[PDB]
């Protein structure tokens, strides 16, 4: 069964919405990738952040093996004994009074804007069904159609029927504007990335993180951060707000939540907003179900046992260091917190973002580009020094050879 | 850690969007469950008909256990070699072309929204975002802002925030009703549940969803069947489409695709529809992930290998027939369809429908209300007839009890 069966297989029986790196993995062991023909590759992709612990970690493989044998799903229709101690164990992680457990990043995303609004209409006293929540342009949470409403990226919106309303988008790393759209009484919320990451992992200027929260709090407007990729050690620190010891009304968890190996999504908040919604009021067949639960307590456990923050930290100055010693002819810009980081190709006639990750999979590292001239750098928290440097002479040596 | 010690944790940590029934379970085998205090109990809920093949299947717990060791998230911006054979399977199991993977229900809702609104402007042509999606009321599909919009349950929608525009609802088995809504041309879709789920299990009138057929075909509407419930053996086929012999031009599958392992869910249609997705314009994290594959095929596979199918036929029938021996004005109605099914009560103010599932619980057997005066009842496909008669005698019991 060869990687072109793999891929012919695919192109027969399932939808075109991707068009993926053509490799073909059959097996993951921390930070490497082996391919059907045997081939390893370094992971510099860790599944959009998802497996911030390396694949396949003993733990949280244990974790899920020691519970699928008692119990995996009772629904929230009933109680079981697992989604307490995760709820305890995380909201006390993360200093807020309660969680409220999805799936997916888009669901925990959806989650935050029904808050948001519910919040709006009992709380705040907007008059219903007027209440706004703003977006940054080049974000990216998913894609159900309401995700898609606030996106600035036509090949995500377009073609898809009327968008939701009540979505409003102002420039990202821009406090003026932010100001500007807060004015409006209405607006119950604002949603950013703390480092947008499908944009192309754009860091904002020092203070922006700052200058939101404070604009935030000043009009009584929920400040809402997706942590979905940017959290849980990937750059360094638990939360990428922490880096401006800034602390957001709603907090968005996901993608690493499980270390890969169970769909766990999380929406963070106090009180007075989590509890403007009712029993009844909102819900998911597989929210908060015992086995995703066990996972992602063995994930977080992960993360903090094994310092990945600090060592994604530690690692990222050294490769963004070293990256930055490419020349300004080649590579037009390095950017980056922890181990989230990008680097910015000047394209020509003779190459783009793709070639260059088709030359780096020959060369057994797998990256992915993000829109014709940006490659992201993001390998799993758990890789050591030595294997960050041969990682930079496989990336050195491939960019240099166009 | 008694019983009321976990109710109290979630009280304190976890959002309220629940009010579950006061049962706290550790351990889950087949049709059974077990809380903390030891004690034993029919599952007549299978967590929303997630758990078809009875909690903890060995044939999918070993495929989970199996795949975990290998590989369990890549995500497809490449490859992995699970997810092309879940695709054959799936796709050649129903005959459609393709399926799209997804996670949770909601999204492969949300899916065929995105796929009958880019259908219905870039193959039927209907104007930029005019076109309409049809719902029946009473339809429940999710907790998404576009799934809420869609609701006619206020509990479901009220206060959160203004509703997507294009949904159109009318009456549920209501052929007139669907004539007249596809009269307006910008129609591009028409989803229905073949029975409606979480309103009280509906079942149209026979002859119904063959006259969706006809009329959706014959004004040029696709038909969505949300088999996300009613499909995979529940009612006593493979789908309950098939108890007319007509063929959507959407099928939903999910919950019990994985055997409540995995969030797993599907979309199937041909290629004129599937194909009207291009890359890059639609997706999930999680989507199609090695591990949730490997979880649903064999998952199928028990479907198939155990014939659930055509044991929930014949042990509906004993189980509704039974339970209109019940006095008629004490129960005033019972109504479904193989395994899923649902008991109407005499709802006064010495007894709802919530205290009988606590007199239920008290005698053994778990199931949920959905409305103040109806009960469904839900056991997992895997239970035996000897079984379904001491669940009916404890049925019997309860109610004749008050
Ligand atoms: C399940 C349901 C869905 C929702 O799927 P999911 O997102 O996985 O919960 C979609 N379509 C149908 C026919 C269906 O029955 C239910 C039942 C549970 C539930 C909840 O707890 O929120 C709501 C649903 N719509
Ligand atoms: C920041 C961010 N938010 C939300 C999402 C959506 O997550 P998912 O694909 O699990 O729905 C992604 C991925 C993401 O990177
Ligand atoms: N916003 C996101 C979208 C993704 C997808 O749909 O594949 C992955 C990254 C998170």
Same mark, same amino acid.
């Not at 921390?30 to 599944?47: A, C, M, N, Q, T």
């Not at 709603?250 to 769909?263: E, R």
């Given at each position: 069964?060869?990687?072109?069966?793999?891929?012919?297989?695919?192109?027969?029986?399932?939808?075109?919405?991707?068009?993926?790196?053509?490799?073909?993995?059959?097996?993951?062991?921390?930070?490497?990738?082996?391919?059907?023909?045997?081939?390893?590759?370094?992971?510099?992709?860790?599944?959009?952040?998802?497996?911030?612990?390396?694949?396949?970690?003993?733990?949280?493989?244990?974790?899920?093996?020691?519970?699928?044998?008692?119990?995996?799903?009772?629904?929230?229709?009933?109680?079981?004994?697992?989604?307490?101690?995760?709820?305890?164990?995380?909201?006390?992680?993360?200093?807020?009074?309660?969680?409220?457990?999805?799936?997916?990043?888009?669901?925990?995303?959806?989650?935050?804007?029904?808050?948001?609004?519910?919040?709006?209409?009992?709380?705040?006293?907007?008059?219903?069904?007027?209440?706004?929540?703003?977006?940054?342009?080049?974000?990216?949470?998913?894609?159900?159609?309401?995700?898609?409403?606030?996106?600035?990226?036509?090949?995500?919106?377009?073609?898809?029927?009327?968008?939701?309303?009540?979505?409003?988008?102002?420039?990202?790393?821009?406090?003026?504007?932010?100001?500007?759209?807060?004015?409006?009484?209405?607006?119950?919320?604002?949603?950013?990335?703390?480092?947008?990451?499908?944009?192309?992992?754009?860091?904002?200027?020092?203070?922006?993180?700052?200058?939101?929260?404070?604009?935030?709090?000043?009009?009584?407007?929920?400040?809402?951060?997706?942590?979905?990729?940017?959290?849980?050690?990937? $750059?360094?620190? #638990?939360? @990428?707000?922490?880096?401006?010891?800034?602390?957001? *009304?709603?907090? /968005? +968890?996901? &993608?690493?939540?499980?270390?890969?190996?169970?769909?766990?999504?999380?929406?963070?908040?106090?009180?007075?907003?989590?509890?403007?919604?009712?029993?009844?009021?909102?819900?998911?067949?597989?929210?908060?179900?015992?086995?995703?639960?066990?996972?992602?307590?063995?994930?977080?456990?992960?993360?903090?046992?094994?310092?990945?923050?600090?060592?994604?930290?530690?690692?990222?100055?050294?490769?963004?260091?070293?990256?930055?010693?490419?020349?300004?002819?080649?590579?037009?810009?390095?950017?980056?917190?922890?181990?989230?980081?990008?680097?910015?190709?000047?394209? $020509?006639?003779? #190459?783009? @973002?793709?070639?260059?990750?088709?030359?780096?999979? *020959?060369?057994? /590292? +797998?990256? &992915?580009?993000?829109?014709?001239?940006?490659?992201?750098?993001?390998?799993?928290?758990?890789?050591?020094?030595?294997?960050?440097?041969?990682?930079?002479?496989?990336?050195?040596?491939?960019?240099?050879?166009?």
């Amino acid at each position: 069964p060869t990687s072109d069966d793999i891929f012919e297989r695919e192109y027969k029986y399932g939808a075109h919405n991707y068009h993926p790196l053509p490799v073909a993995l059959e097996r993951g062991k921390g930070i490497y990738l082996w391919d059907v023909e045997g081939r390893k590759y370094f992971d510099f992709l860790s599944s959009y952040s998802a497996v911030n612990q390396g694949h396949c970690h003993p733990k949280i493989v244990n974790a899920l093996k020691s519970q699928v044998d008692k119990l995996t799903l009772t629904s929230r229709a009933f109680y079981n004994n697992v989604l307490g101690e995760y709820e305890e164990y995380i909201t006390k992680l993360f200093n807020y009074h309660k969680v409220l457990p999805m799936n997916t990043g888009v669901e925990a995303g959806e989650t935050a804007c029904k808050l948001a609004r519910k919040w709006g209409y009992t709380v705040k006293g907007i008059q219903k069904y007027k209440a706004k929540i703003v977006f940054a342009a080049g974000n990216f949470w998913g894609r159900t159609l309401s995700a898609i409403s606030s996106s600035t990226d036509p090949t995500s919106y377009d073609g898809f029927g009327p968008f939701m309303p009540g979505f409003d988008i102002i420039p990202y790393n821009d406090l003026p504007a932010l100001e500007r759209a807060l004015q409006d009484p209405n607006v119950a919320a604002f949603m950013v990335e703390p480092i947008q990451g499908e944009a192309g992992v754009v860091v904002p200027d020092p203070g922006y993180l700052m200058g939101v929260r404070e604009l935030c709090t000043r009009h009584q407007v929920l400040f809402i951060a997706d942590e979905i990729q940017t959290g849980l050690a990937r $750059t360094g620190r #638990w939360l @990428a707000v922490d880096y401006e010891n800034v602390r957001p *009304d709603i907090v /968005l +968890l996901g &993608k690493a939540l499980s270390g890969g190996l169970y769909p766990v999504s999380a929406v963070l908040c106090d009180d007075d907003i989590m509890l403007t919604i009712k029993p009844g009021e909102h819900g998911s067949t597989y929210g908060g179900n015992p086995l995703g639960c066990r996972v992602a307590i063995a994930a977080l456990e992960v993360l903090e046992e094994e310092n990945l923050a600090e060592n994604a930290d530690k690692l990222g100055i050294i490769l963004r260091n070293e990256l930055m010693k490419l020349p300004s002819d080649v590579v037009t810009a390095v950017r980056g917190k922890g181990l989230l980081n990008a680097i910015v190709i000047k394209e $020509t006639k003779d #190459w783009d @973002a793709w070639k260059v990750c088709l030359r780096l999979r *020959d060369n057994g /590292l +797998l990256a &992915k580009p993000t829109h014709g001239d940006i490659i992201r750098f993001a390998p799993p928290l758990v890789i050591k020094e030595d294997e960050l440097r041969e990682s930079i002479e496989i990336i050195n040596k491939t960019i240099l050879s166009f």
